[PDB]
Design an enzyme around this catalytic site. Sequence first.
Site, short mmCIF file in Angstrom:
data_model
loop_
_atom_site.label_atom_id
_atom_site.label_comp_id
_atom_site.label_asym_id
_atom_site.label_seq_id
_atom_site.Cartn_x
_atom_site.Cartn_y
_atom_site.Cartn_z
N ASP A 258 33.62 -41.49 4.59
CA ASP A 258 34.13 -41.22 3.16
C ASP A 258 35.67 -41.98 3.14
O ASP A 258 36.62 -40.92 3.44
CB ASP A 258 34.08 -40.03 2.66
CG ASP A 258 34.85 -39.88 0.93
OD1 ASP A 258 34.90 -40.90 0.67
OD2 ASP A 258 34.92 -38.77 0.68
N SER B 47 42.62 -56.05 -7.05
CA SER B 47 41.77 -57.23 -7.05
C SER B 47 42.58 -58.30 -8.07
O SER B 47 43.25 -57.88 -9.02
CB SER B 47 40.34 -56.99 -7.54
OG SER B 47 39.61 -57.88 -7.76
#
Length: 330
Positions: A35, A199
């Site tokens: 994770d 992004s």
Amino acid sequence: STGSATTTPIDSLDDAYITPVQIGTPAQTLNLDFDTGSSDLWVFSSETTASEVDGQTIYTPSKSTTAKLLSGATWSISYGDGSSSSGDVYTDTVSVGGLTVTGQAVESAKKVSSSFTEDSTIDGLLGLAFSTLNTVSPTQQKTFFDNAKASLDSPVFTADLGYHAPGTYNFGFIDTTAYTGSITYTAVSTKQGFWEWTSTGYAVGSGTFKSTSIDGIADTGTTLLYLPATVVSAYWAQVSGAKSSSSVGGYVFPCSATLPSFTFGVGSARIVIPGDYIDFGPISTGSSSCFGGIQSSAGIGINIFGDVALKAAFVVFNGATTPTLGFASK
């Protein structure tokens, strides 16, 4: 040193991925959920409340000659999906894919929430976010990656998740045969303890690319792609019959649909998520309403590039002095 381990989807929807991990002496092999959105290595154990164990393999520290109680240390964690676990702490030898760390904090669960109990395939979590998020008190502990880093050939790990197929976590090297083209690296902020990056925009299907900054985290422990409501609405508007359902808890679409791809930007590069990756199947067994793999982050407080996004790429988690994230097509 290096390590290399195969990671395998737990079910037919790629809800999560498990990776075998050797703990203790002699080795006890547990299948852990790696994770990159958390920083605790915790396991089902001989100390876990019996009624909360349902098929998991447990770590038994009393059977390990290298286990030592970390006296006084406790831990307690809550995840974004509302699940939780807590307990006490041992140090022991932990190996992943041939890479060994001695003195790793292994957090033994005394209690786990129902979502963990119900998932018989997940024997615990191995956190790969920054150690500043580790929950052990009163002495915070380091992640497996942080402990291994100085011994690694290169201070990196990579995630290469499969779509309905096994993939690979590598430690200490970049497998240049595992991706196509070049790797595009992008800046990371560690301010919130995550692999947080920005992004450069998105496209829906064959549509034009929209240049827009989207801050979010690379999180292998989250199944879906969670993005701003504007972006998600633009995606689902291209699917006839798709709608957001408060009763279901997100966007659903007719199971008869063909889903468009979704592209996200990494600098000037582009990663394309095929439409099929965005299909999470019937909302309930036999339903003709299907659950979407792109959902709104509104009310999460953070955008999350979960498995839906990451499995479309070869992803480098660069833990050098200035950390960065790399993405390549594959």
